[PDB]
Amino acid sequence: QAIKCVVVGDGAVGKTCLLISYTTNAFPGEYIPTVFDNYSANVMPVNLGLWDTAGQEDYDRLRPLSYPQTDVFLICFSLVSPASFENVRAKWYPEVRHHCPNTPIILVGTKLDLRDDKDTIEKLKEKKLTPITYPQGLAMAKEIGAVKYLECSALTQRGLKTVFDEAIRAVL
Numbered sequence: 512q513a514i515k516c517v518v519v520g521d522g523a524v525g526k527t528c529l530l531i532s533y534t535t536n537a538f539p540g541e542y543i544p545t546v547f548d549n550y551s552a553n554v555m556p557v558n559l560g561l562w563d564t565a566g567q568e569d570y571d572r573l574r575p576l577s578y579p580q581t582d583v584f585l586i587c588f589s590l591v592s593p594a595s596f597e598n599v600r601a602k603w604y605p606e607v608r609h610h611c612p613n614t615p616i617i618l619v620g621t622k623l624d625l626r627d628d629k630d631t632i633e634k635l636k637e638k639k640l641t642p643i644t645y646p647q648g649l650a651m652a653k654e655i656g657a658v659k660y661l662e663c664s665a666l667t668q669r670g671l672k673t674v675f676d677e678a679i680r681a682v683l
């Protein structure tokens with residue numbers, strides 16, 4: 512069987528690194544491929560088709576062309592970017608539900624390894640911000656009726672497997 516999963520969220524939340532680290536078992540490091548592509552993993556036996564998107568505003572009109580026949584969406588935000596997190600409810604949930612009113616959503620917080628990073632915490636403090644905590648993410652997930660809320664690091668592959676196992680379980 513074949514499942515189509517689309518991954519959405521602001522530019523730089525780690526969407527492409529999440530897909531390559533998951534399917535490669537390696538953080539692409541300093542050269543992240545720039546061609547927006549679709550990837551695939553066979554897991555048990557299911558084929559998970561993983562569609563990357565261009566999350567920048569410039570692509571607002573073209574991006575939804577990859578949405579038809581999506582089985583499940585990953586809405587990604589960076590745990591160390593409250594602006595990407597606010598955009599879950601400002602932008603991504605309304606956009607996904609406008610085109611796909613009944614497709615299940617999974618809310619994914621990314622870059623978990625930076626949550627307890629001194630240098631990241633300090634830079635956010637000077638804008639009077641703090642990383643998104645687990646209770647905050649879970650609250651957002653039930654606000655938007657996400658079937659599940661998960662946190663992961665593409666860099667350390669902590670939590671990464673569960674994201675896509677849960678994506679498959681939202682289908683089937």
Ligand SMILES: Nc1nc2c(ncn2[C@@H]2O[C@H](COP(=O)(O)OP(=O)(O)O)[C@@H](O)[C@H]2O)c(=O)[nH]1
Pocket residue numbers: 521522523524525526527528529540543566621622623624625663664665666667
């Ligand atoms: N520290 C850390 N950085 C990450 C992680 N995932 C992605 N990044 C970085 O965040 C930036 C954008 O990642 P990318 O996957 O291109 O984001 P996209 O625009 O959402 O596809 C790059 O500088 C990556 O090195 C992570 O789990 N931890």
Ligand SMILES: [Mg+2]
Pocket residue numbers: 526527528563564
């Ligand atoms: Mg990308």
